[PDB]
Every structure is written in C-alpha cells, then in structure tokens.
Design a protein around this ligand. Structure first.
Ligand SMILES: O=C(O)[C@@]1(NCc2ccccc2)CCOC1
Lengths: 300, 237
C-alpha cells in the first residue's frame, strides 16, 4: 500500500480520493491518505469550502514515484509534487502514520468499484491526453476545455481527447455517405480502433477517463467525449462481441456510481434514449439498460 | 441559419443560392394485389433545384430504375437527392457554384450536409417558408419530360420564361409561388384560368402563357381568388 502525505491543510476543503470524499477543516492537523491500493491509477481531488468554483485534482500512480500534496498560498491551491529523496519521504510518512494524522483509503474487501471504473485507464495514456511532461502526475479541473471544444483557448491547458465528429470527412468515406452516416462501423473499426487507438482497451480507457473527469470535476467537455464514444459504438452495426459485452460492464458500473442527484447534469437524454432504444446495439446492453431503467426512469 | 420572412430579400441578392425540393423524387401509386394485399408502384420523379434570382431550374429526372432492388426507399430518396445536388455543384464552374443551398424540408439537412463535406463554405440551410414546389409536376411541360424519361436525365429550364425582362426577381418569385400555390390548391381551376383565353399561347420555348403586363395582373387576381375560394370551401367560411 502507498501513501500521499500532505504537508498541511491551511484552507478548509472537501478532498476526494477516487469515488470517496471527506471534509478537512481550516488548519486541521491533517497529513494525508494512506493504504492506497497499488495496481490502479488514482485521482485526488479538491473543492474549496469558501469557493466551490474550480474543482481540481491530480491523476497519479504510486508505482511511478513518491507524491505529496502541499498548499501554495500564492496560487491558492493544493499542489501535487514529487519527492525524489526516498529516505526523506519514507521518514515523513512514517512519522505521520505513527501520529495517526492520516485517513485510510477505505476500500471494502468485496468492493471492486474502482477497478471496474478504471479497468482500462493507464497513467501513460492519461499523460498523453493531459500534456505536462515534466510531471509524472496529471492536473485536471472543472474548466479545462477539450481540443474539440477549442476548434469550435490556451492549448497547453487543454484536454487532448481524440476528436469524434459524425459529420466530418474523417467519419465519412467519399462515395459511402449514406452508408457511413447511418452505420458508423467504418469510423469505429477502421478509423478509430485500427487507426487511432490501435485496440479496444485504449478506446475504453479514454472513455472511462472521460467519464471520471466529468463526474469528479464536472468537466463538461469530458462529459461530451464520454457520450460521443458511447454513441459511436452503439451507432455501429458491426462491433466485436467482446467489445459490446465489455461496454455493458463499463457503463453499468459508471451508472451505478453516478450520484443520483447529478443525473440531470451528467446524462444526455438524447444519447441514452438513442443508444438503449433506437441504435443498432439497443439489445446488446442488457445490464446497463436494466440499471438505467430502475435508477433513472425519468431520463427515459 | 433558417430562411424566413424577415430575411426574404436575401433570396434576390447577388450571392448565388439554390432551393432544393425533394417532394417529387420518390413518387408511387398504391394498389391492391391479387391476394388482397397492398403494393406500391414507383413512377418517375424529379429533384427541383431552383436559383430564385435567375429562374434557372436544374430538373434532375429520377427514373424508376434507381429504386430497383433497394430498401427503405423514402430514406434512400433523401440521400439520392443529396448525391445528385452534390454532383450538380461539382459539375458547375467555381464561379457558378452556390454559396448557400436552402432545403424546403428539414429531413434533407443531414443528407445534404454529409454529401457536401468537401464544400465547407457552402451553407446548407432550412426555411420556414411554406413553398409550393411540390406542384412543379402540375406544369405540363415539366410533367411531360419526367414521365417520358427512359433513363436518368437532367433538363434545364428557366422557370420564369422571359419575365425578368420586365419584372424584378422578387416579383417573379412571387408570381411563381402564387401560380404554384394555386395549382397545388385546385389544379383544374388554376389550369382553366391560365388557358381560358385561346388567343394567349405558351411559346414553344416557355412554360407559361405569354401574358401582357395587364393580363398578368388579372391572372394573379384570379389565382388569389381561387386560393381564397378554396380556403372557404375547406373551412366552411
Ligand atoms: O463523511 C465522510 O467523511 C464520508 N467519507 C468517508 C471517508 C473518510 C475519510 C477518507 C475517505 C472517506 C463518509 C460517507 O461519505 C462521506
């Protein structure tokens, strides 16, 4: 198990670690999070008590380095940093653990939620969507725009998701206009999977990362990307059976984890009604259809 | 965006534009089969593509062979329309290509947009005008060329005859739409109004009779009366 210590907590803040959230009071003796499961990416995120504007946070993998959080009173935020001195880091952590000034990542043994939400998410792929090569961890916030949002303004601070546009020359072969617009299989299988993503695992990884940024930061462009990647599959007549079965699992766990009270801002009624009831794959997502009908029947 | 009454003079400015009406592309008659089921028989149709400033009509005749062995014909008809309009655009010299294409039915927006991806600067727009272009097949010379066609064919017409020698495009379009609305509302009576005077003929190279300026005023009044008469008959007014 790994640990992300905090130097201190000078401002009152709600801290989230993956799907869990907890409050810290101004100048509370809080010095970090321990028992973080090795083997997955993680996200540590923040919403200030005195200014719920800008949710922000950091994606990281404790296998890549020793990371800690320290508040910056000039830029006014909790910043992730890497500690290259290993013995210093271990000694800091050991003292904070002995004084019991850390919270424990409260993973229930039976509970596979975080694995199920991050199955295909890799830190190396995150670092290509979020470009800041001098750090091993990636900062995301609620306001960051996507490369596609910008085309329609600072490029260094953008989310470089793969652009999906159903009415673009990339999506439509000259001479196959009706075919490719009504059946997106070409665009999914040749352009996106074989061409850009190389395999379905990388495609699902980006889909999962987009959902998580939408949910944890309220990042609108990420929500747009998540829905576009779902619609591209559901609107394709020819999809490998293993991808359809995996998508049903992915979406089921996403819908299961979504806060009920955020469904109005995180779920696109058009896309979901199309995907579940009109699309080529309307009958291939049994688990997702069942949870959607029981949890959010108003949206449908 | 959408074209309506507020931006109506835009139709007659110097930016080349075309209206595309697809209402006569896929035409059928419905009949009973020997077993008492119902079947359709397609008949030749046409795309109505009109420059409202110059009166140039690009009438693409849609021969029934294009439906042979195809499914979902009403859907295919929209994509065939978009394909043919795109092909017409590509066939025109650059300086004759439209800057805007206005579709009379909003279901044509996506088919045409997708076919015109190679022309990102040609705007594809809907309209809130209710235009009577479906009645194009009530113009005898247009109906004749469509029905006689044995293969796909494009025929070029000036739907305003020589009117622009005497009237503006705005006025010509208003006359055309009144004539077509009358033919749509009561075709027999409209045709009777247009041919009631044997001494006024249709030139070989024209679609409409050779009315003098004053006769056009009388004809236009009779067309308005027909439309109003039919409205009262319909609604018991
Ligand atoms: O009230 C709280 O703090 C909650 N989070 C528990 C938690 C505490 C420390 C570390 C991670 C999680 C309990 C239910 O959900 C909110």
């Amino acid at each position: 198990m790994n640990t992300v210590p905090f130097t201190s907590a000078p401002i009152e803040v709600t801290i989230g670690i993956d799907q869990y959230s907890f409050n810290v009071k101004e100048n509370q003796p809080f010095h970090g999070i321990k028992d973080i499961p090795i083997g997955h990416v993680h996200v540590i995120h923040f919403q200030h008590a005195d200014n719920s504007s800008m949710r922000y946070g950091y994606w990281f993998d404790c296998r890549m380095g020793n990371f800690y959080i320290q508040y910056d009173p000039k830029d006014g935020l909790y910043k992730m940093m890497e500690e290259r001195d290993g013995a210093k880091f271990e000694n800091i952590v050991h003292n904070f653990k002995e004084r019991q000034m850390m919270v424990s990542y409260p993973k229930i043994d039976e509970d596979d939620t975080w694995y199920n939400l991050t199955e295909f998410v890799q830190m190396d792929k995150i670092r290509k969507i979020v470009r800041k090569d001098e750090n091993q961890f990636s900062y995301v916030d609620s306001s960051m725009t996507t490369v596609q949002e910008n085309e329609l303004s600072d490029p260094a601070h953008s989310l470089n998701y793969t652009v999906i546009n159903f009415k673009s020359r990339e999506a439509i072969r000259p001479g196959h206009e009706m075919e490719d617009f009504l059946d997106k299989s070409y665009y999914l299988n040749t352009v996106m999977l074989q061409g850009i993503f190389k395999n379905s695992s990388n495609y699902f990884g980006e889909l999962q990362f987009a959902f998580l940024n939408a949910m944890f930061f309220g990042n609108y462009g990420s929500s747009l990307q998540w829905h576009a990647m779902i619609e591209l599959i559901c609107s394709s007549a020819t999809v490998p059976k293993h991808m359809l079965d995996k998508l049903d699992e992915i979406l089921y766990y996403q819908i299961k984890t979504l806060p009920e009270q955020y469904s109005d801002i995180l779920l696109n009624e058009r896309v979901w009604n199309i995907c579940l009831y009109s699309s080529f794959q309307k009958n291939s997502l049994h688990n997702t259809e069942k949870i959607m009908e029981n949890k959010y029947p108003e949206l449908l | 965006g959408a074209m309506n009454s507020s931006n109506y003079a835009e139709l007659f400015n110097n930016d080349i534009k075309l209206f595309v009406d697809d209402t006569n592309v896929y035409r059928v008659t419905v009949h009973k089969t020997f077993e008492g089921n119902v079947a359709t028989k397609a008949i030749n149709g046409c795309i109505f593509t009109l420059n409202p400033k110059t009166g140039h009509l690009f009438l693409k005749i849609i021969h029934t062979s294009v439906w042979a062995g195809q499914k979902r014909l009403s859907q295919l008809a929209k994509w065939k329309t978009a394909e043919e309009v795109s092909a017409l655009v590509r066939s025109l010299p650059k300086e004759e290509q439209p800057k805007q294409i206005i579709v009379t039915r909003k279901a044509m927006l996506d088919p045409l947009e997708v076919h015109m991806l190679d022309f990102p600067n040609i705007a594809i727009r809907p309209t809130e005008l209710r235009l009577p272009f479906s009645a194009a097949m009530s113009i005898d010379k247009l109906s004749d060329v469509v029905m006689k066609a044995t293969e796909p064919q494009m025929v070029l017409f000036n739907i305003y005859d020589d009117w622009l020698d005497r009237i503006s495009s705005y006025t010509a379009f208003s006359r055309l739409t009144l004539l077509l609305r009358a033919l749509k509302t009561n075709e027999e009576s409209a045709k009777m109004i247009l041919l009631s005077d044997p001494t006024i003929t249709i030139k070989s190279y024209h679609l409409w009779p050779s009315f003098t300026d004053e006769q056009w005023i009388t004809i236009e009044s009779q067309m308005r009366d027909l439309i109003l008469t039919e409205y009262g008959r319909k609604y018991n007014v």
